Amino acid sequence: RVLLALHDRAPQLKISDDRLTVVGEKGYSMVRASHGVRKGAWYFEITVDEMPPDTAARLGWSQPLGNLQAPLGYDKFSYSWRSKKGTKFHQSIGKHYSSGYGQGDVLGFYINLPEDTSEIIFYKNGVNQGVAYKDIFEGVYFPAISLYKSCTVSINFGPCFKYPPKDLTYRPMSDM
Amino acid sequence: YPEEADGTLDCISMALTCTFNRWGTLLAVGCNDGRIVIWDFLTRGIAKIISAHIHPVCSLCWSRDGHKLVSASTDNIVSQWDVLSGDCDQRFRFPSPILKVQYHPRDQNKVLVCPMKSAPVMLTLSDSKHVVLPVDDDSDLNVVASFDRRGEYIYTGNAKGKILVLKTDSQDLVASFRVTTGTSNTTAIKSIEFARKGSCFLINTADRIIRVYDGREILTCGRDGEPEPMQKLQDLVNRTPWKKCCFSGDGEYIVAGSARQHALYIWEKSIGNLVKILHGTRGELLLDVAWHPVRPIIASISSGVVSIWAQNQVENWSAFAPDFKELDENVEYEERESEDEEVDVTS
């Protein structure tokens, strides 16, 4: 079943006992999921339930050989987008993208991955936020979460999505 | 304010007296065989050795210009020197041996010299026109006198107890009082010293009591006054007679040396309590005590040994870090994630 992992953790990180929710640690360290792909156009959902005032939390795809302890966006393995002031990051450098995300949304992420016979798109209430960058590298693509003080976000992989868009032909990760 | 031992000087034996300039750079160590050894502070060296005489050099006094000492001995010569190459400019072979010399602070042609027996008479440099300072009684045989701070007056002191004040050159009798020593028995005077800011001054009496007065108070008293003292100092436990007194660099901390025990006592002008007793080699007898005007370090002359008494800055040097304050337990704050004025620089 498409779920989380056991040793994909820091000891200050708390992967919750439902394997559908991560509990935030007040610093900045990276937790990641367990079921990813390498080639194709795929999709999952992160349901952001509750948020404090004046937060900082970054979400996006990642590759497992990155940093286990970083805020997301520190490496060339992964991209990110911040909950405050809406910034895309390449090795965590301020490059203004949008305005960030708040309380009560679903951050359901799209990937695009061609091959000789690649972009990362973020959604938020179905809104096509645009394109972060183009032609990303080769590897296994896990999701990645790093959080603020102990807030509440939920993950989702079932085909009964909360916000299914109608602009691209995507597939759920639970087909694995 | 001095609290340590800090070092001493085994350079030239038989030290007898010293004093300083306005700036506090050199040290004119008076010697028994007619010498003035000059030692430096910031370089710790002996620059010039003036082999002046062969007789005990008793008194010394620096002037304001930084060029003209004045001394006397049992050689009984009112000498003078210069620190460039040891130039004895003048030589006054006089009778009646000397106790203390003293300039006027800015009219340095006029020096004030205390003989052995009769009244202090104001000498000069060039001419022999000594200005007779009229003491009335003249039966006391030991009368001491001095200026004020700015050289604006002349203060005197007999051995009976009567104090007279004259103008610095024309001798206006403006103040007259006898000291309130005991009830029926008065006492003599041995020294009167003055500060570098203000007109407070001490009366080194001889019933083991120091008395302190101000200049404005006695100028308000004037002729036939009864000035009460600002402060009465003594030491009733150890029953100690006094040798030499002085002042601090601001006229706040009186430094009076003993005459029996080789110890310094330090008071306050305002409150009037003892603050610290200093000590040294217990087997000496102390004669002269020098205070440094801009930085509080004391010199003590006994048995040819002169000692430097600082406080070492044990607090710390804090030159580098006005910043960087200390947190005792491991305090963590790791939540966080992130042309107006024209002053004459050429002044």
UniProtKB/Swiss-Prot annotation, chain A:
Mod. after translation: Both monomethylated and dimethylated on arginine residues in the C-terminus. Methylation is not required for nuclear localization, nor for MLL complex integrity or maintenance of global histone H3K4me3 levels.
Cellular localization per UniProt: Nucleus
Tissue-wise expression: Ubiquitously expressed. Predominantly expressed in adult heart and testis and fetal lung and liver, with barely detectable expression in adult lung, liver, kidney, prostate, and peripheral leukocytes.
Domain B30.2/SPRY: 1-162
Role: Transcriptional regulator. Component or associated component of some histone methyltransferase complexes which regulates transcription through recruitment of those complexes to gene promoters. Component of the Set1/Ash2 histone methyltransferase (HMT) complex, a complex that specifically methylates 'Lys-4' of histone H3, but not if the neighboring 'Lys-9' residue is already methylated. As part of the MLL1/MLL complex it is involved in methylation and dimethylation at 'Lys-4' of histone H3. May play a role in hematopoiesis.
Subunit architecture: Interacts with HCFC1. Core component of several methyltransferase-containing complexes including MLL1/MLL, MLL2/3 (also named ASCOM complex) and MLL4/WBP7.
Annotated protein name in UniProt: Set1/Ash2 histone methyltransferase complex subunit ASH2
Source organism (scientific name): Homo sapiens
First and last residues shown, out of full length: 380 to 597 of 628
From Swiss-Prot, chain B:
Tissue expression summary: Ubiquitously expressed.
Keyword Transcription attributed: yes
GO MF annotation terms: histone binding; transcription cis-regulatory region binding
Keywords, alphabetical: Chromatin regulator, Isopeptide bond, Nucleus, Phosphoprotein, Repeat, Transcription, Transcription regulation, Ubl conjugation, WD repeat
WD repeats: 10-51, 52-91, 136-176, 184-223, 237-279, 281-319
GO BP annotation list: DNA damage response; response to estrogen; transcription initiation-coupled chromatin remodeling
In-chain residues carrying the UniProt-annotated modification Phosphothreonine: T240
Residues modified to Phosphoserine: S338
Glycyl lysine isopeptide (Lys-Gly) (interchain with G-Cter in SUMO2) crosslink location in chain: K117
One Gene Ontology term, aspect cellular component: histone methyltransferase complex
Effect of D344A: Reduced ability to stimulate KMT2A methyltransferase activity in association with WDR5 and ASH2L
Transmembrane annotation, as ranges: none
Coiled-coil features, chain-numbered ranges: none
Annotated compartments: Nucleus
Ranges where the record places region Interaction with WDR5: 339-347
Chief site of localization: nucleus
Function noted in UniProt: In embryonic stem (ES) cells, plays a crucial role in the differentiation potential, particularly along the neural lineage, regulating gene induction and H3 'Lys-4' methylation at key developmental loci, including that mediated by retinoic acid. Does not affect ES cell self-renewal. Component or associated component of some histone methyltransferase complexes which regulates transcription through recruitment of those complexes to gene promoters. As part of the MLL1/MLL complex, involved in mono-, di- and trimethylation at 'Lys-4' of histone H3.
Known partners and oligomeric status: Component of the SET1 complex, at least composed of the catalytic subunit (SETD1A or SETD1B), WDR5, WDR82, RBBP5, ASH2L/ASH2, CXXC1/CFP1, HCFC1 and DPY30. Core component of several methyltransferase-containing complexes including MLL1/MLL, MLL2/3 (also named ASCOM complex) and MLL4/WBP7.
Protein name (database record): Retinoblastoma-binding protein 5
Native organism: Homo sapiens (Human)
Residues included from the entire protein: 13 to 379 of 538
